[PDB]
Amino acid sequence: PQVHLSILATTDIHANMMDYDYYSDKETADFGLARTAQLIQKHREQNPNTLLVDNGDLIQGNPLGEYAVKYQKDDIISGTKTHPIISVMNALKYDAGTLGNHEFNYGLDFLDGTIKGADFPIVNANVKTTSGENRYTPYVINEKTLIDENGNEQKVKVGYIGFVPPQIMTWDKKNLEGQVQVQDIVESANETIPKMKAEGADVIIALAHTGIEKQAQSSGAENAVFDLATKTKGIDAIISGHQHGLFPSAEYAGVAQFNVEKGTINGIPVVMPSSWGKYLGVIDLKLEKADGSWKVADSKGSIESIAGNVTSRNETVTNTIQQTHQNTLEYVRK
Amino acid sequence: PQVHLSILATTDIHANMMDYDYYSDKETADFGLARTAQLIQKHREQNPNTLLVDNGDLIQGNPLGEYAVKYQKDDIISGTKTHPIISVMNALKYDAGTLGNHEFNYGLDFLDGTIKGADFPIVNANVKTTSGENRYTPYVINEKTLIDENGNEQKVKVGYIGFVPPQIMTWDKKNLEGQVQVQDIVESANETIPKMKAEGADVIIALAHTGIEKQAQSSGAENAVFDLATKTKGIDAIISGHQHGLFPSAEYAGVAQFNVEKGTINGIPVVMPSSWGKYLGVIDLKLEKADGSWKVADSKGSIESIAGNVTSRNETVTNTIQQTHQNTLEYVRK
Ligand SMILES: [Mg+2]
Ligand SMILES: [Mg+2]
Ligand SMILES: [Mg+2]
Ligand SMILES: [Mn+2]
Ligand SMILES: [Mn+2]
């Protein structure tokens, strides 16, 4: 009897809550989480066993992100106020998030404070203190009661692990030098996966804030998804970002280890849903239990555009962010 | 009897030649000089006395700009090959251009090489050598034979002067420290304008790669257009950019010195046509001659969107850039 599990994913939102360009000071139809959330609802309606994750580069990039750090830094840091972007994610009932490089742009304290307000775990395994301790929650495992194809309950332990590029040491040198170090993405995965398996994880989802190259690279690579898929063992699904590209896409047809039709790399489903909420990532897993152990019998990775599928703003996003958005308009209009 | 002179302006194109997103690897209708050039053609058909200028942040920003610096650096530097973006500008018969902050991202030598290939002058008055000499052509004056409203010829000397924000010393510290310095925008204008008037300039156009604030600022300001308009004398038209905003726009109604209906600041027409070719700036001057000297009798600044006015790519742009664009696709796809 199988379990059909769906994972929905956003990446590189870059603080675009509304379908709005603060620079031209105009509405747009082309991007924004208020539009992507319409796809999220649609997919949730299709499968009760649905998880929702974000892949980082979330809280920074436009004037709304600037507004939050300028006007609410102290209260966000203390946990008094929830970061307004995190409030949206909370309203949407995200199950997990992770850190992109741009999460570090406003300093470590603001990031810690941002994380404090999330209802869901925000994980990262490769950023460490100067003495070698995990600087963030490295992974989490949640026991989920999923419904199988016979309608029966199946308890399945789902784990999330996250990765950021080591190049944050360059990009955010001022904020980070002397305060953290960053372990190679693949080496972090290999160190951490065994622990997740020991602690009972049945399905492991990588929130890999890192892109895709067509061939192997060595340690320290900025865009390491191919290496994650080939050099590790135990990851069942990979969410990709950072490059602001699309995966799957036709360009990868004929590249060793890639299956464009299935959206897989080395047999593991991978999705990279563009940037700014222009696409939603969708991974389907068919889980099969044997010998008390779960495996992935079949999978697919796909992406869906908001273009042509979405024509209006999601009310949950709009209602949640509205005040902050109007505050941002005032801030921008000086 | 008057002369109607029209000035068309682009700004912050950021190497978007085609209406194409290299990151998602697909066509867009949203931006690109190939679309803006359709507005250029339309406006040129409306008035024989038309000038065309670019306001900087032109050669950098996307993978096409990267392709040029990576694959053609040596030949661009020597002047052996024209920068492909500059070939497009040459083909569209631009009359002048200027330096935005991003022109410095690839170093001083590459920028010098890029400029060598332009058929038109690229001016900048405020970047200086460490000893105080102008690092670039500070201004140019061209005697134009314009046609007045009686159909008669009128020789009018048009000058172009350009400015970049002094903050390039921070943004491009590695490329610039110890090699140039940057004079305050207003102070550069006040130093340079008298010389232009001495050399006979009748009409002076500022290619001001700098944005707009609603009230006065002091020396060293990043966004200095208000101060240019109020603290200098002798500028007849200002092209603004850098902020990626819109001007004229309704937000400025009721702000002292601003006239939204006419698109002026302190009586001088100003335009800021968004970014990436999403708008074309259009300034109309009605020039009158009294006693051997020209003055601007009436003026207007306006911007026009490619949205709703343009539905296809301009052939001169496409034909000129096609090979480079195809090479860029190969580069991006690896
Ligand atoms: Mg960063
Ligand atoms: Mg990133
Ligand atoms: Mg700029
Ligand atoms: Mn990003
Ligand atoms: Mn720009």
From Swiss-Prot, chains A, B:
It comes from the Bacteria. Induction: Expression is induced in response to phosphate starvation in a PhoR-dependent manner. A divalent metal cation 2 binds at D57, N101, H209, H242. A divalent metal cation 1 binds at D12, H14, D57, H244. It is found in: Secreted, Cell wall. Belongs to the 5'-nucleotidase family. Catalyzes the release of inorganic phosphate from 2',3'-cyclic nucleotides through consecutive 2',3'-phosphodiesterase and 3'- (or 2') nucleotidase activities. Also possesses a 5'-nucleotidase activity. Does not catalyze the release of inorganic phosphate from 3',5'-cyclic nucleotides. Probably plays a role in the cellular reprocessing of nucleotides present in the medium, under conditions of phosphate shortage. The N-terminal region (amino acids 35-623) is able to catalyze the release of phosphate from 2',3'-cyclic nucleotides, but not from 5'-nucleotides. This is Trifunctional nucleotide phosphoesterase protein YfkN. The chain holds residues 41 to 374 of 1462 of the full protein.
